[PDB]
Amino acid sequence: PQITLWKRPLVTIKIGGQLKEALLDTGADDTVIEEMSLPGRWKPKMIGGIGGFIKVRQYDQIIIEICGHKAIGTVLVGPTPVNIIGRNLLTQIGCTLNF
Amino acid sequence: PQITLWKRPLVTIKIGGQLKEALLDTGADDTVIEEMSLPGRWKPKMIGGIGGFIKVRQYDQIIIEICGHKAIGTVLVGPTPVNIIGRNLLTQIGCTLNF
């Protein structure tokens, strides 16, 4: 798709067989998703301060689908107030900025 | 142009006669630029944190050029470590996300 920026670029993503709303965030290097069940192994990271705040599971090799575009990469899964798709996954779906 | 996201979308902007590097940030509502002189009247504003963290100066109607594309809008000027071009300005240059 082509997404304008008049509103927050929130799209439906599929992750863990669930549909979630998430922000396409070119300002984010990485991807944070609301707490949910994902299969298997993950490592503890903390994020939210300069250093860290919020306990998130780093899951590698997570398949996410965005508007029909499958991407695999590292996802931080915890109580973020917003699901955020950063560049690590934006690049996987071929997402560019255009003007 | 078409900016891919393998790297941060840092571009050259021209503002107040000055050339700067700025992050094209779809996760940002507004545009914050590092401490500099602009000719307007401004309004004191607080941004960041939980109800305000840093004092910035809100300059309305500022002409800025983002990769050769002219836009006018509100620029906040303050101690930001990163010049951020938010959606308020990305929309003015007709910037879209595409995949």
Binding site: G27, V32, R87 | D29
Partner: peptide, 4 residues
């Protein structure tokens, strides 16, 4: 915005 920064976010990562």
């Amino acid at each position: 915005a920064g976010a990562a």
